[PDB]
Amino acid sequence: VDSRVDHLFPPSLYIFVIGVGLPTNCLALWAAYRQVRQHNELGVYLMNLSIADLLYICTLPLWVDYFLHHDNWIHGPGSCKLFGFIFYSNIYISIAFLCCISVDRYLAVAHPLRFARLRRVKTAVAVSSVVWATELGANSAPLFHDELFRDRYNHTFCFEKFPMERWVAWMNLYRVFVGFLFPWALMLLCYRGILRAVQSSVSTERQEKVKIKRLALSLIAIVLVCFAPYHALLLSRSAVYLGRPWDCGFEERVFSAYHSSLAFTSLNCVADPILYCLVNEGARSDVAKALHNL
């Protein structure tokens, strides 16, 4: 039952994220659709990443007023189960679909002559549906459990509880080791293979190989820069519990840094549209044509 200062950094970082990430993700979704209309399957995964980003962005204002009102959620019991679910599961949706994009690219570069069936529009939408269903189902655990967390320090605690309960900590261990590192490991392996397949390209000039290297490094470094503080803090905070649950010891001071690492996670919603629909020259041409059709 200890409170800190988390009312200026997250509250305005979310403002920046919303204001920059609604239009970029709308454009990314349009470019994804135009990729789909050309019988290219990458647009499907791009749509499924952009829709997650859009849901996160449109459910952010509940939390900008959750933090700006000084941890006060006067938006009711029912709302916290839904908007909180979206806000706490879009990161996992997004990382899963980023992993899908990386795996799709790897099969299309390292093995350009094989796996024809796995690279189609119908297969892409089937995999997309499977990923959405499985991720929502495995994040379903904090739905039934009615939060109803109030304390004697003028809080309201929408979806958050200090200290963690039994189920929240074991949920957080999954939320880290299966929702962050495993998709990250697959992403890194896939892009290392993609860069491995380019040194044997006679066609591409050495300048283009380094130009590909910079993107393939940024795409997996931004994941660290956006997610690693949050998940390292979550893992540490949970590991303190299971060794000594009754002591509100570590949760006393790392609270403010934990909320800051929660807010800072929300940059991998303006980062994704950039790296996946604006750095590319061809996709930017389609985006310009779209902006030139209005």
From Swiss-Prot:
**Keywords on record:** Cell membrane, Disulfide bond, G-protein coupled receptor, Glycoprotein, Membrane, Receptor, Transducer, Transmembrane, Transmembrane helix
| Compartments it resides in | Cell membrane
rRNA-binding: is it a keyword of this entry?
no
Q: Which stretches are annotated as coiled coil? A: none
Site feature location: Required for activation: 135
- Which residues are listed under the site Proton sensing? 145, 155, 259
> What's in the GO CC field?
plasma membrane
Control of this protein's activity: Activated by a network of residues that connects an extracellular-facing cavity to Glu-135, a conserved charged residue buried in the transmembrane core of the receptor. Protonation likely drives conformational changes in extracellular loop 2 (ECL2), which stabilizes movement of transmembrane 3 (TM3) and a series of rearrangements that connect the extracellular-facing cavity to Glu-135, a residue only conserved in proton-sensing G-protein coupled receptors.
Protein name per its UniProtKB record: G-protein coupled receptor 4
The shown chain, on whole-protein numbering, covers 13 to 306 of 365
